[PDB]
Structure formats: C-alpha cells, structure tokens
Amino acid sequence: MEVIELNKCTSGQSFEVILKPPSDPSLEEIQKKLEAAEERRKYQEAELLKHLAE
Amino acid sequence: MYTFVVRDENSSVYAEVSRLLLATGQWKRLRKDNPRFNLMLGERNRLPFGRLGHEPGLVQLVNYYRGADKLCRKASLVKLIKTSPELSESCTWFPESYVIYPTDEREVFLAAYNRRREGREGNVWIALISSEASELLDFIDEQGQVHVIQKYLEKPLLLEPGHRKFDIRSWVLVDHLYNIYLYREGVLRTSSEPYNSANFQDKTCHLTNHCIQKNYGRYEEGNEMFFEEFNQYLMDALNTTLENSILLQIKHIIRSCLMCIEPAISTKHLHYQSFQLFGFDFMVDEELKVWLIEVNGAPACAQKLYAELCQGIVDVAISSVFPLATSIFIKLHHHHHH
Amino acid sequence: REIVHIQAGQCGNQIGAKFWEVISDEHGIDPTGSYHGDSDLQLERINVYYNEATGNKYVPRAILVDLEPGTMDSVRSGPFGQIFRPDNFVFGQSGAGNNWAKGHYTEGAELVDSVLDVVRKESESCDCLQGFQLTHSLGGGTGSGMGTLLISKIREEYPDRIMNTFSVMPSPKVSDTVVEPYNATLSVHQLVENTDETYCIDNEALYDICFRTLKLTTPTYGDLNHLVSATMSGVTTCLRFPGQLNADLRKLAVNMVPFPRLHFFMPGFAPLTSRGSQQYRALTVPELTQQMFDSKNMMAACDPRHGRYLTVAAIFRGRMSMKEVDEQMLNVQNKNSSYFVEWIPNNVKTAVCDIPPRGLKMSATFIGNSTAIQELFKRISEQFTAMFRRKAFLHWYTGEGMDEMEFTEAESNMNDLVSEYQQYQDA
Amino acid sequence: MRECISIHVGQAGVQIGNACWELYCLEHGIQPDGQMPSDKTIGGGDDSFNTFFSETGAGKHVPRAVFVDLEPTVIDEVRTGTYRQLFHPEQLITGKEDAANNYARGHYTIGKEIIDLVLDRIRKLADQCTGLQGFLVFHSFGGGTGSGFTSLLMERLSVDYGKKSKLEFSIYPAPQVSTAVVEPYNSILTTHTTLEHSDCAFMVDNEAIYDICRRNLDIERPTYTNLNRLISQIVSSITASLRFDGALNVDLTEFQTNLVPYPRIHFPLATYAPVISAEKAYHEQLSVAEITNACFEPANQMVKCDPRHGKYMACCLLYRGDVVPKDVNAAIATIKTKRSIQFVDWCPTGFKVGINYQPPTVVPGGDLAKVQRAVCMLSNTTAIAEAWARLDHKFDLMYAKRAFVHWYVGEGMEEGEFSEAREDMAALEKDYEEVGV
C-alpha cells in the first residue's frame, strides 16, 4: 500500500513498499594452524620412510 | 518395479497398504534409510520433507502433506478458522472456541462467557466439561501445555433406543492433484450409556471415543453404527435420509477446510508430490445441524473398512502416479458462479 | 600430466605390449612412431603416455622389465616392437623360475637399481608427473616378486605419486605352476599397502568368457589378452582424450577409494567379442548397461550379487544419447539399490567419450569396487593354506633366504583384507 | 565511487567469472580488446561501471578481477580466450597440481604454497582503488580448490582487509553434473570455516539450474556452458545495482543491511524469471504480474525448497526492462492475497524494489531469448535450510563409517575438524529453525 523512498533517475527508479509493520582469527593463529598440519604430514611421511627403511 | 519405504510401524492403515503393494508383485520394499525410493510412508514427527525430490530419475511421492498440521492441531485449527477469511470467526459449523495459554485470548473468552451465563442462555464448555470458567482455567494451568476452550453442544442428537450420544467419523483422501475424495463408508462412534444432561463429570456418556467405552456391544457391534443402519434409523425415526440431513453439511465442511489451506500445502508444481488420508470428526445436534469437532492427520480405520479403504488408497493416490501393467469415493467439487 | 608405464615379467610385457598396440591405434601412431590420423582430439592429451622426439616421432613413456630376455626379445620383434625406446629395455639373464623370492630378494634385487635409473630418467622429463602404472602377473616370479619390489622402491623415491596396477591373478584353470598361490599371496600383501588402484584380472574369468561367450573351444593367452587390452584401453579413455572429465589420477582415485586398503577393482567390458569375430550389430544403450553390470562380463571371477558396490565408474564410448545413458544408469541403481551401499550417496558415476575403440561403434568399460572381490582373495587363501599346512614346495623359497614366518604374516594380512571387505558388506 | 574486486577460485569460479565478465562487457558496451567507445573520460573516471572496471591511458577497460586455480588448464582457456586482451597476466594465477577434490589439500597442503602470491596479486588491485568496498568471491562447494583454498583466502582477507565487506557466489553440489562423491565433506568443511568471514552468500544449486535448463530452455543434457550463461544472468541482476545508476544496493554494505539482519543467517534465496528458449519460435511476452508471480514458484529458484513452510526476513525485487512502480505494487497486492508469505514478527512485511529500464542483455548465439521485462527476487527465507539438511545428511551417512576420511587426514587435517564443522552446521540448522517456526 504505502510507497516510500521513491528515487528516480534516467536509468530507472527504486522504492520500498510496506504491506504491514513488525510485531576473527589473527595472522598468527592462521599460520600456526597451517604449519601444525604440515608437521602432521611430515610425521606421517616419516613413519612411511621409516617403515620402508625396515 | 517401483520401490517404497516404511518409517511408521504403528500405522495400522499403511501397514495394510504396504501389504497390498507387495502382493501386486510390482512393488519392492527397501530399508528405512534407503533414499532411492519412489514412495515414502513417512513418520508422524519431523518427517524430512526437505530431502524429497532431490533424487535424479526418481519421481518421489509421500503419504503426508507438509503443513497439514495447521488443520490437524486443535490450537492451530481454531487459529486457522478465525484467521482465515474463507472460514472466519463467523463460522456457522464450528463451535465458538478460544486459545488459552497456561500462566492468548483469555480476556476475550470471559466477555464472551458473560451473557452466556449472565444472560439466561445455556452454558456448558469443554477443554474437562464444566459450566464455570474458573473450574476450567484452573485445570489447564494444572496440566502443562496449551489447551483450547470450546462451547459444549448441550443439545446433541440422541439415538433411540438408548437416548445415546454419538460422533461421526469420515475418511477423506487427497491425492497429488488435490482431488478431494470422501470415503462413502463412514462410521458412527456411538455412546451406549444414556446421555445425562445434568451431571457432566461422568464422561462415559459425554465422550464418545472408542477407547473410553471399553454397556459396550449392546445395540451395535463394537459401538460402531455404519451408514446403512444410521440411514435406515433416520428414515424410520425422522422421515429423512443421511445424504440430505447430514452428509451435505459434511461434504461442505470437508471441502471448505481443505480448499482453505490448499495454496499452503499443494504440491502441484513441486519437485516432490504429496497425498494424505484424513479423519474428520463431526457432531450432530437435535436440529440435525452438523458441527466440526476436529481433524485427524494420522487416522486409524474401522476393521470392516480396512480392506476396502486401503485398496482405494492404492488405486487413486499411488497407482495414479505409478501405473501398473464403480468407485468407493465421492469426489468433492463445486464451482458456483457469483 | 604424464604417466610412466612399467611392465614386468612374461605376462606383464605381453599385455603391456598389447596395451601400447591398442592405444597407439586409437591415437593413430604407427609402428614406427609416426602420427597418421584425421582428428586432432587424438593429440590433445597424448602427452600423458607418449614422449615427443626427433621430428614429431612419438615414443611411449614405457619401461620393459624382465629377468630373462625371452619375452622382451619377442616384444622387440613384435608389431609395435620398434616404437619402444631401446634404452628402456632393462633385462637380466637368470630368470626367476616362477619364484617370488628370486624376483623380490635375490635375482631381482640385482637388477632393480638398473630399472629405477630408467624410471628416474623418464620422470625428470615430465612437466608434472601424476603417477605410475604397472602391468604384471602375481603367480610368477618376476612380475610378481620384482614388480612389487619396484613398487615399494618407487613409493620410497616418489611417496606422493599415484601408483596404479593391472594385476593378473593366478587360477588352477589357467596355471603354469603349483606355487602360484604362494607368489600371489606374497604380492597382494605388497599391493594392499603400495598401490592406489589395482585392477584384478582373474585368468579363470578370462578363460570362462573366451569359452562360454566368445565360443572358443581352447583359448590361448593371446585370446585372454584381447579381453585385457580392451579393458586397459577403456579405463584410460578419459585420460587420453579431451572430454567432460577434468581429472588426474589422484582425483580419480579419491572418488573411488573410500578406504585405503580396499582399492582392488573388478573390471568389466561390453560388448564381449573374440579376436577376428566381426560384430555387425551395434548394441543399444540398454544392452550396454545390462551387459557391463552382468557377472559374465566381469574379469574377476566374483559374483557381484555376493557383495555390495562401494563405488562404481563407467565409461561409455561412441556416438550415443548421453540422456539415454543417464536414464539407463539411473535405472540399474534404482532397480538394484540393495547391491549399492546406502552410506555413500551417488557412488555410481559415468563418463562419455565420442571416440569409440577399433572394431566397435560403441562400447562400455566397467570399473566396480565391490566387496565381492573378497571371493577372489578367499580362493587364493584356500589354495595357499592347502599347501602351507604341509609346508609343501616351500624349499624353493627358504633356499632363497625366506623364513616360514613371512608366509604366516602374508597369510594373516590377506585374511585381514578379506575380513575388512566383510565388515562393509554387512553395514 | 567505490571499487569492488572479484575473486574467481577453482574451475567453477573461473568459468562462471568468464560468463559474467563476458556479459558485463556486453551490458556496458565494452569490446573484447577493452575499448569502450561510449566512455568519454579517457584514462580514468568514477562512473558506476568503474566499480568493476579500471582504465588505462590507452583507453582499455580492465576488470578488477583475479582468477586463481591450483591447475592451469581452465585459466589457460582465459589466457587464449576471446577476452584474452581484457585481462592482465598478473590477474591470472595457476598452480601445477589441483587439490583433487580434497578440501584439506587445497586448504592446508597446496594452499600454503600460493596464498602469499594471491594476496599480493590482490594487493596490486587494491592499490589501484581510491575507496575499496570489498570482494565478490566465486567458487564451488565441492571442489578442493573451490572449497579448500577459498576458506583460507577468506580468513586472510578478513585480516588484511578487516573493514571491507565480502560476498559469496557459491555453487552447491549436484550429482547430475558432478563426478565427485566427497563433495558433502568439502561443502561442510568450507562453510564452517568461511561462515564468520562472509557477510552475504548467494547459493546456487546446480540441480536447480540443470532442471531450469531442461524444463524451460529445452536442453536435454545441459553443459557447464549452458549452466554458466544462465547463472551469469542472475549474478548480473544482483550486481547491476553496483554497476549502474540507482539508489538500491549501491554498495556491498547495503546488501547485508537489506538482506541480512542476523549475521550467521546470510544465505538469501534467489529466484529468476522469465527464462525463455531462444529456439522458441512463438512467444507471448510476459507481464509484470506474471514474472513477479513466478518469483514464488519453487521451480524458478536457484535452490529447490519451499518458502511456504518458513519465514521471510527480507525481500528485494530487481526488475530489468519495461517496468514501472505502479504495475509492481498491483502485482504485489494480487500475489499477497493468493500465496503464503509469512515474515518474522520482528520484521516489516514489505519489499524493496529496484528497477533498471534497460532490459536484460543476452549473449549472441546463446540459449536465452530476449525479453521485454525480467526480474530477480532476493528473499532471505528460512526455507533455504533444506539445502543444509540435505547436505548434512549425506555428510552423516559417509562419516559414520569414516569413508574417504583418510584422504583428508593424509594431508595433515585432523579427524576432529570434521566434527567441529558438522556441529557448527548443526547449530546453523537450529538457528534457522528458531527463526522459522
């Protein structure tokens, strides 16, 4: 019913119609998580090369 | 070879449907967590509708209408009626009712219960059946959750022999095209002890549930009078039929209820389809005026009618979508021009 | 995305030479290594298997290994014998005598470093090596013993590279020696740990197919190898030709292997055809689908109805309705959903390539990771125990330095593998 | 004027980016060589289109975009594409080995080797900005790169550009077009890691786009090209307010304001109409009432779900073509009495409307027919949570058996991150339900 905030221009026009009213991690912590996961790979890769060494 | 699943084991109705399907030798039952199904006989609570219609190369169907609980809940039904203009607060066939929350429209109930008491008019209501407000408002707060207060029909139609109370149960089926099918074989769940107008507290003659009353087996086998007899009784005792005096009102109330919520639950253009069996409970007063009591989302059937109804469901609701390699229903439709 | 091919032993080189013979035709490469085709689609992903040298002559990235020169001399004089880089012919003289120990510990150890020098030389030329592939049998000595020795040593030098294999399983129906169960059991232990994909080819299944379907009263190893080469070509289609499927070996392996030890696949193919026998009638899509899923077309003598599919991959080739393909694939799953695990959603994937193989207007290659593969390992385990309970023919191995305990361990690890498959069959 | 930088991650992100910038050029009249004859301010300017394009003294209009993939082949087709002259080699970044549909590999393993390079190449663009708003990130949930490397970048961008907003255009996985099986893992993992770093995310289920292409465009088996050219139209409608004159959603901040009252619940449902086949010989042009009414048909949504069984928090109507406010209000009035539109109690039941008189531009030789008027509705409904329910169920089935988990653990990821992510998703499903019922 009620049209408001009607704005117009050459390209078009915009408005609002109301029908009824109502009723972060740091650079430190990131680089630590990435490198902690890299050491888990290095450990796993080591256990492989150890297993292959035996 | 179509496939289906079963996720409600207490369903006496669809336990018979699952049987019939397997007996055709063209349906195969899967596990209850197997997603590659054509048909789902889902549960009663938290049915995962959000996971239907996302299996490529599978036309999926379910035996429940999502959002159909608004009609099958007493608190919701009252709301649905006095909120939806299609039914309105001025409803003729629905008893005056109010939603009351334990410590809402309690203040609205009081004033409405004013001249019903302080106005010489008849006065009985139901949640317990009493004639005093505080006797009721004290009970609802004592149990726990929300209840509905409703005007008690003090002048019910009474079956002779016996001077008994009763309630009618109709089974309705809504297929995927939202065709409203009324089952021709209904049932009267009657009382056996004579209705007592004075004392309300002995609820054996006021409440007509098949559970409570188990004078059982006196006039009828199982306190269940079927239409052929009830029709004959009306003809002999009142010189009218079941079709005219009651069924027109029933077929009207059913359609009015489902057509109201059609745009809210219809699966016309959805990615999964729905059908469902409903159980409407009606009430007839001495002036042969039918009143809607409640709608049951997960209805149980009558023993005699299990075979016929459970076969009917397969024909129009299931086989219509999944065809295999005179009708027991009355299609409810009406297009009056104005 | 380059692949380094290796082929070890008699069986390995014969199916391997056959593989290069088939795909060289699909890519239009002649016996002399010169290109001669029509389309350009058969050169977009040819870097995967071929090396360019001296004026657009294509040399397979293939290394031919054996402990005796008998078979490799046949390859060199064969049809596409010239195409192979002569330096990549690495061979001994002593042979392996169908002995796993000789191939893995003594005779093969003496030669393995020479092979790795060729592997290393090929790898360093690759812009981005995606993995290795091996062809061999598990019933002999070289391809079994030395083949697994190579894999173990390749994983040591390339621990982050995919290793796939085409492994021929021994069977009493088509048998050379009685010690095949021993050699096979010892090899499976190695394969469970050090490969990403193993296509289990049972010589029993290849035999039964050649006899009961292709109508060949007495099939030879040549007949058996027609079936294998057709499958080998099929599973590598989407890697060899430009298509919808943008996947390297790693990605392909990720979506097929839910558990690291359970990577032993049942290969299938349709339509089944014999050498020379000309097919005139092109199969409909419903026929391709029904056949590639039938046990008779599987190349591991295992009944897929005795297990469940963890994952399935299918490659249709030729000019066909990709809609009809999807419909027929979705029709198998929905009709036999009990043979696919429910706890891996959408575990059946498909791909299509416009280029068909030679001789067929359209074909389908089936790759099934079924738990029914345990029947294959149970067979080997039975044949293994029957001899090992009496310690029979064991002197051939203890004479090469092996102890009885190593056999007991290999026996236990395969029975573990069997029990592993059984765990997921009842989930 | 405030600039916006687009980031296209992975195959899906890149190829969609291609489709969008292709369409942007046609809408602004920019040629493949980057020349824009209508732009009379040579060498620079601060027009509305400059939000997405910078300018060189030679008069070239270059996208403020960076393409990143862990694998060269997809982006190589941009380096040699019809719009090759459009981009700068610095804007295009490739690795040698993809993430193999492994979230952990794209995030931890391979992501670590390239994250610094991408942030630098992005910094090169941000230095050319006078007033950066933030970023539009295109990617897939299912890809290892699209899921893994995206979440890592979204974490860093929140560190290096803490003030700037960040919007997402995410491709939700569909079995019909994917050969992957582990996409549910990747989807849950990236959602959990990106959630607090994304102000507003537009999800697109390939399933919906796929069926729309089959149903309305009569394409029997949609290719990615078919999917992308349709997706680009939706993206264009959503970003048009940033690239053209207007007063609705003029900056990235206003997207969150209008569509996202609660931070976590920042996944608006998009619905687009009309979608008409170019091969359709005879077509009756649809009215404002007809196309607006189509915004409430689930068959037209980017994600298949049922808004009737949920609650709205916000709703924007973005028209393109012959439309005036009068016809819209009449259409809204009619629809309100026919359909089920329930808002939350703490929001007004209303619609923010934006109209651009220029009708939607179509790619020449494309599958879409030129229409006189089209609309894209952006409605933040709780019904979109159905997509999460689907995804979380598939996740539960596989993880209960720990299938494929070893691939992720083998890349350094912990089995605990699977459960942390899944519990966060469980909390999200609950948040949606608190608001929705």
Ligand SMILES: Nc1nc2c(ncn2[C@@H]2O[C@H](COP(=O)(O)OP(=O)(O)OP(=O)(O)O)[C@@H](O)[C@H]2O)c(=O)[nH]1
């Ligand atoms: N709509 C659309 N979806 C795509 C497109 N390309 C890939 N996808 C989807 O993306 C998902 C797989 O992720 P990809 O984008 O291919 O993988 P990625 O981001 O490159 O990461 P990697 O695994 O390292 O290759 C699948 O579900 C595809 O359906 C595309 O061009 N358009």
Ligand SMILES: Nc1ncnc2c1ncn2[C@@H]1O[C@H](COP(=O)(O)OP(=O)(O)CP(=O)(O)O)[C@@H](O)[C@H]1O
């Ligand atoms: N306003 C009213 N007037 C008269 N009787 C009423 C009434 N409301 C309820 N009843 C009686 O209550 C009986 C059953 O109660 P009701 O159906 O409301 O509960 P219920 O849901 O447990 C039975 P069902 O299992 O069929 O749903 C009816 O048979 C009817 O006689």
Ligand SMILES: Nc1nc2c(ncn2[C@@H]2O[C@H](COP(=O)(O)OP(=O)(O)O)[C@@H](O)[C@H]2O)c(=O)[nH]1
């Ligand atoms: N399919 C096939 N199987 C073979 C061939 N040659 C041998 N085999 C099988 O492989 C086993 C013998 O292995 P073999 O290759 O001779 O051992 P190696 O040469 O010492 O490595 C037996 O079980 C045979 O059935 C062949 O040409 N084709």
Ligand SMILES: c1ccc(Oc2cccc(CNc3cc4c(cn3)[nH]c3ccccc34)c2)cc1
């Ligand atoms: C000599 C020749 C070959 C050999 O084995 C191989 C070598 C390289 C590559 C392949 C193919 N692997 C593969 C393909 C697919 C897959 C999982 N794995 N999933 C899919 C889904 C759709 C389409 C295709 C695939 C096998 C060994 C020796």
Ligand SMILES: [Ca+2]
């Ligand atoms: Ca300018």
Ligand SMILES: [Mg+2]
């Ligand atoms: Mg031999």
Ligand SMILES: [Mg+2]
């Ligand atoms: Mg990729």
